[PDB]
Specification:
Length: about 325
Amino acid sequence: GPVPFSHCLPTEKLQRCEKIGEGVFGEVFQTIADHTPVAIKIIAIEGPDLVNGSHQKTFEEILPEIIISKELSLLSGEVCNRTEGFIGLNSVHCVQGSYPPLLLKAWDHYNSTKGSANDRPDFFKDDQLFIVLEFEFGGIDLEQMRTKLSSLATAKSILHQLTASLAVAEASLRFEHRDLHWGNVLLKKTSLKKLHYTLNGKSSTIPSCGLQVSIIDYTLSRLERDGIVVFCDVSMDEDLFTGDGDYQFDIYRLMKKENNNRWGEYHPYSNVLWLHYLTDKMLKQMTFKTKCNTPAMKQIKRKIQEFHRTMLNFSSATDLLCQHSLFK
Ligand SMILES: c1cc(-c2c[nH]c3cc4cnccc4cc23)ccn1
Ligand SMILES: [Zn+2]
């Protein structure tokens, strides 16, 4: 059976909710559970009302996200193919109720301060179902940190972390993110100097520059285990491929070209495309505490420029991580 909203979000948890993000198919709140920060994603399912410009997902249409979230969450505890560069999934519930006024309050504050593209979620009836995913808290997204990084050395760490994470998921799960815009890259402060990953049994380190990167939001993602493929089939979707105003929206069309609109197949080139979009963002749309005025910064910039103009000649995140000069 579904449980009441109160079972997942009792009052003290609701009272500490702060909205941190959104999309067509999800509101995301930060809160505290057992004195520990968490991020809660809430998705309306199975209901008749339009929400945020779409029909609601069915339970079946949400399973891919749940499954892929569970799989990627495993990767921090594996051995041969191991990374912390995804996000932990703690729990999944099916909840029933109208939307809690306290969530509406936090939604309102977000709308007042950052602005929303979503409908105010205030029209759901007390029979409405939602999926509630509780994740580990992964930090602040790269878009909101676009004026906050220390230098291009930090950016280099971020690219390396992302490439490694995607490589490990490629090797373990034939994973493609398929929607890795800069909202889906989280940064968190760490006092670790060196982050560790293991790819096909070989362990390596990455200088952190004080950040841990987490890749989030598996709504468009694809993977497989033992020949069973889990993905979001967008072969008939029209909107996803007619965006403009940002390279982000070319990526969707370039992915479609690479895979011939067959979304069940494995095309890890999609990870390269996203990494290219991210590198592009770092070179064009970011401001740094240290400017381009030292030999070191000139060199790292030159290297990231060389990465930008050569990376699309590689076939996967694995290929980039193993072969590209940037990571040597
Ligand atoms: C839209 C926005 C988001 C989103 C923005 N900022 C976030 C921070 C999180 C931290 N940890 C874990 C998950 C988190 C999720 C988000 C996710 C999905 N769709
Ligand atoms: Zn429970």
